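BUG-821 | component: ligand-complex export | severity: low

The export step for KMJ jobs runs without errors, but we want the raw record kept on the ticket for reference. Input record follows.
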Amino acid sequence: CPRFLKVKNWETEVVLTDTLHLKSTLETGCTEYICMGSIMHPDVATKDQLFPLAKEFIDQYYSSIKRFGSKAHMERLEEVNKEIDTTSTYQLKDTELIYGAKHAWRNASRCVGRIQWSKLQVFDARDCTTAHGMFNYICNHVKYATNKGNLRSAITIFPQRTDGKHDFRVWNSQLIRYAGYKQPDGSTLGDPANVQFTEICIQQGWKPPRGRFDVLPLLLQANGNDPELFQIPPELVLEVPIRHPKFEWFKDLGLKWYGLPAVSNMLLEIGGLEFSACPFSGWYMGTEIGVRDYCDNSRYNILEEVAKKMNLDMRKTSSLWKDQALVEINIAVLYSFQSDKVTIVDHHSATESFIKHMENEYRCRGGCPADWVWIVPPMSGSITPVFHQEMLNYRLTPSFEYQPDPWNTHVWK
Amino acid sequence: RFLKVKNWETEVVLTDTLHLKSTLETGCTEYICMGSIMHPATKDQLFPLAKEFIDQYYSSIKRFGSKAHMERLEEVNKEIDTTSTYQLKDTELIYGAKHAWRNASRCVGRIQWSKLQVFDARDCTTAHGMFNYICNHVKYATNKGNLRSAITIFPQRTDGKHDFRVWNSQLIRYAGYKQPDGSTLGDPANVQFTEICIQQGWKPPRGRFDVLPLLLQANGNDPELFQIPPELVLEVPIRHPKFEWFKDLGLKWYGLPAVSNMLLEIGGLEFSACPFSGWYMGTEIGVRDYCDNSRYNILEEVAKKMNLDMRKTSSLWKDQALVEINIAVLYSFQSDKVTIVDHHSATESFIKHMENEYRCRGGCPADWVWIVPPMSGSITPVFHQEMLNYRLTPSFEYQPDPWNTHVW
Ligand code: HEM
Ligand code: HEM
Ligand SMILES: Cc1cc(N)nc(CCc2cc(F)cc(CCCN(C)C)c2F)c1
Ligand SMILES: Cc1cc(N)nc(CCc2cc(F)cc(CCCN(C)C)c2F)c1
Ligand SMILES: C[C@H](O)[C@H](O)[C@H]1CNc2nc(N)[nH]c(=O)c2N1
Ligand SMILES: C[C@H](O)[C@H](O)[C@H]1CNc2nc(N)[nH]c(=O)c2N1
Ligand SMILES: [Zn+2]
């Protein structure tokens, strides 16, 4: 592998030099002959597998605190090694847990929000034993991160995997999401993305209000036991009704969205350890709501109704009625969040911040892994600076990974 | 191994076997993906490349292993022996040019690939001859607004000291002028090329839409300047269906998009001058050509006339102006009956193209980074389509700009 790789920005002519790719760990999916960069997704560690993974992480941590090679570094290596020897696993120190969580975000190639990576509040929930305790930790997380609309990024880390039969899992894909209900006539009420999970909740005992914006309950699994349902206290769920600065009729669509984006189905890998329940939250980029949640054909799919109320000609695609309506919806989302003083970032500001972040990471860290397919926003791509920015994608650890949906693997008791 | 691609909107899964036929490199490795990087012979090297191509040609006309096929391989073998190269048959040239288009991972317009008019210009020897062939190309392809895809293929590379080159990046482009006060008049993408034309004796009108002259190099000689006859250059004044003030911006564009700086590789042969043309997707003009910060950069002026609040990015004033400019472009070409496709229709057609190629060919190499349009990405169906990118040959390739290699 070449020692230096160059990326160019075709708008500004700036050339950056990447050396950090030499620390790349796992596989991208690509080969010399095929690129899988647009593919969305392209039994535990043995003692022998765990030793080198832990050492790599411990070495990285002690290098970051400028104590590489120190007595405390060598002693930490020996203590971890003994622990892996006698128990087949090991426990992270609190400092190492925090460092690992921040760096999994720092390394998340698909995240445009990483300029914030070092300001992550880490909640250590490794003492949790029950689904009720998970609910308590999650409620505290949601309250802290929401902060009356002055949102603060945060992660809550539940106990790591042991033998794979005692996993902690949040069955929700996000902590706060709206239910979706398939109707006998084929239509869907609510969010079509969540129909499968909604049906699971109903079978587990949830009584669904069957509305358009019903906050789903938490479905929480502790220590490999069957998951249990809990209702998030509604006063902890900050929501924003969507209105438009010019179009008085926009509020009559009855749209609203929740303020806190909180991913809860990913796995956090630190030093070979696997944290299968690690819900983390930030704040929204407006297009995540205004383009994807609202205008995806397979989601709320409101382009039609908005275009109608805008009195656009919808018979020819070349009138760009979809495009025109999409912008108004995204204007409404940003205006409504700003009016209610709920943190949100538009796609222009976020991508400009990410370029500055990337350049800083290249200069101070030797690179910044980035997934262009995900970094470029889903509207107006080429009038954002990331569109013209060449990027290198590679996998560094600590990392957030996808994992199978737990209902596909769980052994019901 | 067989590889699957999923469309996350429709849940359609396709199975790719065609990638097993690729042998060029992508630039990626198992550890680093370069998917967003823009740019990642001898007798001995030539015959296996020739053999592979002759093989796939005779397989395509269902006479693989025929007597004609055996004879052609031997014919090619002797010719590489006695001359260090070979000459394609006319049928092979046409097949190879259509397949270079069919294989172009970055082109959303490939549903048309087999409707390509191929002009054989391999008997050309001088820049005057190139000019004549290019004028005929432009006239045929323009067709009074009913655009027709075409490619003109000039003689192949021999020793590399005798290349045919079109120095222009496109056959028709507007000049760009570095102003005294530091800014730029016209098209900033072409400032360097414009200056080379001036340095070669071109008298610039110093307007905003001055069609550049052709700078044509034949057989490695110094390039020569030619003016395309203006009656051959179809242009469209841009106006807006609702904003009557839009025409007062004084904007226009040319109807014929015609790439002239790429290299066509067929069976190991390299055609360094191979201008090819189709018709525009509206966003190529209205998003990239007009609104890139390094291009015409008119978002400010348009948003001004729309009286948009331009003090905060979160008003999305840039996004609103962007849509209106692209409405105007489509409306203007359609009103003048000049072929153009919008990004919704184009990506729809591409999804249908992919389905066809997976069925009859076992796959379709596609570069998501280039296929997804530069605006309103996720409300087009390609945004949700997983794609596999791999290099098949015949292919179009980038090459260095001739002013960096040429000795005068
Ligand atoms: C604080 C403000 C943040 C912003 C504005 C932001 C923005 C984004 C956006 C727009 C995406 C693409 C979302 C999509 O299309 O589904 C994304 C992906 C991602 N973000 Fe961030 N994010 C933020 C915070 C965080 C935090 C705190 C973490 C973890 C500690 C994180 C980790 C990730 C990961 C792992 C992905 C990839 C998700 C996947 O591949 O499925 N982000 N982010
Ligand atoms: C007929 C209508 C056509 C349409 C609508 C179309 C559309 C497009 C678009 C929108 C791009 C992206 C260009 C950019 O972003 O700069 C592209 C790229 C490309 N097209 Fe097509 N195209 C057409 C015809 C053709 C033809 C006739 C050929 C060759 C015979 C061709 C070969 C290519 C190649 C090689 C690229 C990649 C360019 C590069 O890598 O820089 N296209 N096409
Ligand atoms: C922390 C955070 C901040 C932010 N501003 N945005 C997000 C994206 C929210 C999101 C929404 C979504 F629909 C899908 C995924 C992928 C991961 C979740 N699982 C489905 C794998 C997401 F991350 C996350
Ligand atoms: C045949 C054809 C049809 C069409 N509809 N579109 C194109 C692309 C036009 C284009 C525009 C542009 F700005 C940059 C590049 C790549 C660099 C090549 N240079 C020759 C310009 C382009 F291919 C080609
Ligand atoms: C097929 C393609 O990989 C898929 O649609 C991706 C494209 N880019 C994306 N980018 C973001 N930010 N989020 C997404 O869900 C997707 N989806
Ligand atoms: C850095 C990045 O590869 C570069 O900006 C690419 C992105 N995608 C593109 N897509 C198209 N269609 N045309 C382009 O010029 C580019 N430029
Ligand atoms: Zn790749």
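Assignee comment: Attached the raw record above. Residues 4 and 250 of chain A are 52 Å apart (CA to CA).
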